[PDB]
Each structure stands twice: as C-alpha cells, then as structure tokens.
C-alpha cells in the first residue's frame, strides 16, 4: 500500500498524583495531525497539521467528547487490569492502544489494526480478519471474553472498513500537497580518520519524507551489515527525517566501499562513494 492512519492512546496511572493521565494523537503516515491530553488546562482535541484546521466545530467537539469519554473509560480499564494481575494500588501502570487502517496505492483498504499493551507488553490484539482476538495471557483472556460478549470486534471492523478509510481518503486529499509528496533524501559521504590505518565513512541521508528508507554499505559489491553502525531514523523538526550509516575501513581502501540509498522519493536507488 502507500498510506495509513493511526491513533495512539496512552493511559498512565500515578497513585498519589491524581487520576490516570490520558493522551491521544492521530497520524496519517508520518505526519501527526491531532492531539488530546487530559492534563491540559482546558482539555480539548487540538490541530497539529495545517490541513486539519479546515474541519468545522462539530469535528472538534465530536473528537473532544470521544477523548473525554475515553479518559474516563481507560481509568476504569487500568483498575480492571491492576486486578487481573493481582497488582498493588501503589504502582504506576500503562495501557497503550494503536489502531487504524492501511490503504493500498490504489486507495483500497489493505488491512485494519487494533492492538493493546499493558506496561509495554502485548496484551490483546484484533486479528487480521477483524473478527477474532489474540490474547497474550490469562488476564487478557478476561478482556477477550468481555469484548466478545459485547461484540467489540464487530464495531471495530465497521469503523476500520468504514469511517477509518473514509476520513483517511479525505485527509489525503485535503493535505495532498504534503501527504502525497515524497521528499527524496539529500545524500553525501563524510570521512573521519580514526587512526593511521583506519577511517570512518559515514553515509548521510537528510531532509527526506516519509521516514521509511534503506541505507547500507557494501564492500566490493557485498554487504557490511554486521559491520555497519546504523543510527535510528530521527526527525529534523520540519516534518522531515535524517539517518546515517557508518563503517570503519582500512585507509586506502575507501574506494572499495559504496553506499546505497533506497527511498520512495527516489526514482532509482542511489549509489554513493566518498569523493576526496
């Protein structure tokens, strides 16, 4: 596919410091577009991308009520899970939920998602059929029986195949100038001598969007996977991302190394080498 929408919910308990905080953020691919934080002075869904601002008041009030309602329900869920694990009321815990729909390059639903975790460990996930569940342990099994008894999967499937895809296509259109524009990485190779016989070659990729990218060093047509230092793609703060890969090589042998860059924004993969 080529596009997706995801909402990320995080509910954190904090005994002795008030009720569980609830935060929600929505994304279309790698662009955030809305947020809600129950700790804000005046909790309300707020815009985070230019193209979502045009939505009318009903949009924002509808969103805010959902997140306010969720704020309460997740506090109940945190109490439920604490009990499911026989945990103390003195510890802080976290429930996380990710859900959304994937669209193919044509715009058709590729697949839907809905997974939760408790304290960073997978808890329960809606299967790809959008009809059954996979519970991680006997605690999640209680959440499962409860959600099957309430026909939750049926509601998620309707939203995932319905509203989810509908609004994503609307967002893709309203923000097409950016959401449907891939920015290729600006690439170059640096050289950092480490010792008399070794030097570091660092292949850079800057200003690209979306975040997906492939950066690899090859020695003699061959890949240096186990010998390549690859930093995690990082956000520049202007919607674009950065990434670099490094390899230490024998001085004099730098011309035997080539950097290969693959990115949606590139009509053809790139091959770079250090240019003294």
């Amino acid at each position: 596919g080529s596009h997706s929408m995801r909402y990320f919910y995080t509910a954190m308990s904090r005994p002795g410091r008030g009720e569980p905080r609830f935060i929600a953020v929505g994304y279309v691919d790698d662009t955030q577009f809305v947020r809600f934080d129950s700790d804000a002075a005046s909790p309300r869904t707020e815009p985070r991308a230019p193209w979502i601002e045009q939505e009318g008041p009903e949009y924002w009030d509808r969103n805010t009520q959902i997140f306010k309602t969720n704020t309460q329900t997740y506090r109940e869920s945190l109490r439920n899970l604490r009990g499911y694990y026989n945990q103390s009321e003195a510890g802080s815990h976290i429930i996380q939920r990710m859900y959304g729909c994937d669209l193919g390059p044509d715009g058709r639903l590729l697949r839907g998602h809905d997974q939760s975790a408790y304290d960073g460990k997978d808890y329960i996930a809606l299967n790809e059929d959008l009809s059954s569940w996979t519970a991680a342990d006997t605690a999640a099994q209680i959440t499962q029986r409860k959600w099957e008894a309430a026909r939750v999967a049926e509601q998620l499937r309707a939203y995932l195949e319905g509203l989810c895809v509908e609004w994503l296509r609307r967002y893709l259109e309203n923000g097409k100038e950016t959401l449907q524009r891939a920015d290729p990485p600006k690439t170059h190779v640096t050289h950092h001598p480490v010792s008399d016989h070794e030097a570091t070659l660092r292949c850079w990729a800057l200003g690209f969007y979306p975040a997906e990218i492939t950066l690899t060093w090859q020695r003699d047509g061959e890949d240096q996977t186990q010998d390549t230092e690859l930093v995690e793609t990082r956000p520049a703060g202007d919607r674009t991302f950065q990434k670099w890969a490094a390899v230490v090589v024998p001085s004099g042998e730098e011309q035997r190394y080539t950097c290969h860059v693959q990115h949606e924004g590139l009509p053809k993969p790139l091959t770079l080498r250090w240019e003294p």
Binding site: G26, K146, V152
Partner: peptide, 10 residues
C-alpha cells in the same frame, strides 16, 4: 476521525 462508538472497558 477516531473510533466513535463508546469504548468498552478492558
């Protein structure tokens, strides 16, 4: 737009 219908507690 987020999943609208009231969510069921875990």
């Amino acid at each position: 737009a987020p999943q609208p219908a009231p969510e069921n507690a875990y």
